[model samples]
Target: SAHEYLLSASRVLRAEELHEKALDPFLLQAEFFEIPMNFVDPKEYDIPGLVRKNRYKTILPNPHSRVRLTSPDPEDPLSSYINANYIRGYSGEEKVYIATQGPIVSTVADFWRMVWQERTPIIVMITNIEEMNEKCTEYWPEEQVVHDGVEITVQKVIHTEDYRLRLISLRRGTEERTLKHYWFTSWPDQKTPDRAPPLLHLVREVEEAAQQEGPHCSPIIVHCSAGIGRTGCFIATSICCQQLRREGVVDILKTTCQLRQDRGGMIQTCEQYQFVHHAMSLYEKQLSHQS
Candidate 1:
């Protein structure tokens, strides 16, 4: 067991080492594919007619960590399904984030249901409503809307250079809770952004918000087109930033492996994998500057 663990152990890099490694695309590519992509076989889930609920036919949630909705129709298996997974935070903290697909028209209600169920405080949307084709639906309301018995109202909207922030209120019966929604539109038509500052800003802003929100904060929701590529990069960057800050070094390879273990095909492309390194390098510079 020890030898097996060592064989698959993550490659740790010091802050200086990561600076050089971040710019090497070929080295990053070679390391990326060495890890296994933990995918759940379609046969693993026996529910019939569940295909209608998924955004992509092949991209199913890893059943073990999948979010199951409390079904109104207990007899109907399809009622309990959603294309989302509970992703761990730094040091395997449970319920730190929920990675899900861009809500389709039909799953918008289900999306809110998960929000209410999990009591998510921060929602990070990385894709626009349409990219080339339809990537994600307009899931939230412009003013107010009621979905699955939850009354959602947009209380305030703050526009920034890289993203838009929405302060929303969710009311169900007499209970109410406030939510922060961060819509990051800086991602261009390409698979990865040309620069990393906007993403790093978003990550740090969200992390600061999470800390201010207190120790009992709920899982932050993160999603993009497929909820894997851009989504993976965001999550990976957040985790590595914490590692770099606390441990004096970072293990991006191990972090990527950890993410893929939770949900298959995370850090989707070689480019995105490289992008995480760049983000971490930028973060290290910021940390050094502050000190």
Candidate 2:
């Protein structure tokens, strides 16, 4: 579902041009609030098995775009359940990213199972292990661990001001693959970070890493505590940055709608929504300076 139009009094600058539009916070706020957040109701699912897999009962995946795991038992629906969705990227690209919730103790195995199943090369985790309360379970092992027959070992860890990067090795029988896990620790629970550079740095770093994976890279796995608020911001930033570079303009409103269509409640707060605009504006400035 989409909105028909914006109020004339609203200060939103729609397609007037990219850089000017991005720099206007009042304009961004008005435009952001107008876009409908296409949230799916939990009652729509009505499945017994899904109750435990979800981080938050209210934040259900849009069933139409939900990712179904390959089940071992055809009769048992729970065998293949994971709280994640296949999110599209810029220009309606398919399977560019997977927006998923942080794994709980019970579903940690399922998380790695999803990683192996999807051949995910990158995981962008944006929540700390504890924030006020337990925001996310520590899903990755300190050194090595095996889950669902897949061997996961931490090869190296590179620490930066904003995030900690883990080079990981995954193996199943003789098959092996490399993965990068970027744990962004600066962002708060329900709000955006104090500064925007770290986030833009993260977005660019992830994009460069994704590019090196070649033209046929698998979907990047992005998660936060409930997998909507910060997850949405990161994905939206990535897509909009690409749009800015490729087309020299950004359509964040459309990008947010696209994300919410795939999974509900992306960019959960208006403040976070505005932070995305701040990020794009910063990226645009960087691009301008470089030129």
Candidate 3:
């Protein structure tokens, strides 16, 4: 399976890069080793088709007047989807829908208003924790604010280990635990130890969250500093694993490509891709145990 190959390749590549120089011909060869091993017709992925098929629906208003499809600066570390948004019709009895990557603070209230009108539950996730807190506190100071007479609970997950507690806090407004912190040291290189923790933490969080069902089972929102690259990987991997389980194989490259088509070239670094591969392996193991 592509997933298994990608996972093995990532480990080998990471080990090789640990002692090699950037331009070292040997390291370059090692990095590309995974490419041919997982070779499959790109056509089989149907990445572009999947993306186009899932374009933002017209039912939801564009959050901002100008949604830049591409990031303004090429030198910037992250890709942009200033205009990216998604609306999946409510599954189950709860009419829950998720909107990601807009100007979060300015649009969150409006989002809650719309969902409340529909009697749907809302889960808002933002990349910048400080910014989200500042904006929400400033705009909506009323504790347990009622929108359309529905009590809307707002919470944020600054790190993965906080998932269980964050969900609990969201439900009961009790901050019983401290948030976990995951940081990335560098990008594009797969050997770094600093990069591993955050990716692993994210995967762990998703696994833990999946086991618990919440009010309306609202769609979990995920975003990184820019809502692409790492954010895309996190969201895509979790969504794919949950929805497409055992139906078709999913590899890191293919999954990243599928997400990038919709959001444009996400999973920007080889290292990030490796991290995803590692994360997926652990997730698959957990799934197997359950089965």
TM value for model 3: 0.45
Question: What are the models' TM-scores?
Answer: 0.93, 0.89, 0.45
Candidate 2: C-alpha lDDT: 0.82
**Once superposed on the true structure, which residue ranges of model 1 sit more than 4 Å away at CA?**
1-7, 46-48, 74-76, 129-133, 190-194
Write one digit per residue (lDDT tens) for candidate 3, span 1-291: 644443344222222232232234454345534343222234433344333222223211133211223313476322232234443321112212233443345444444333332322223343334444542223232334553243534344343332322321122133222112222222223435344445555545554654454444544444343444455556545644543354433444444433433343345455555555555555454566677
Query: Relative to the unseen true structure, what is the C-alpha lDDT of residue 133 in candidate 3, on a scale of 0 to 100?
Result: 51
What is the number of backbone collisions in each predicted candidate, taken in the order shown?
0, 0, 1
lDDT of 2 at 100: 93
Give lDDT: candidate 3, residue 205: 56
Better of 1 and 2 by lDDT: 1
Winner on lDDT between 2 and 3 is 2
Off by over 4 Å in 3: 1-84, 87-99, 102-105, 114-142, 146-150, 154-164, 167-198, 211-218, 239-249, 268-271, 281-291
Q: Sort by lDDT, best first: what order? A: 1, 2, 3
Q: What are the RMSDs of all candidates, in order? A: 2.5, 3.4, 12.4
| Clash pairs, model 2 backbone | none
- Point out where model 2 deviates above 4 Å: 1-25, 47-49, 71-77, 129-133, 188-194
lDDT of 1 by residue, 1-291 (tens): 422432465999998899989988778878877766666678876545766687776677888789888848666657678888989889988879999998887788889999998989999999654562378887889899999789999999999999999999999998999999999988755544357889999999999999988997898999997788899999999999999999999999888877876787788888888888988988999899999
- Give model 1's clash tally: 0
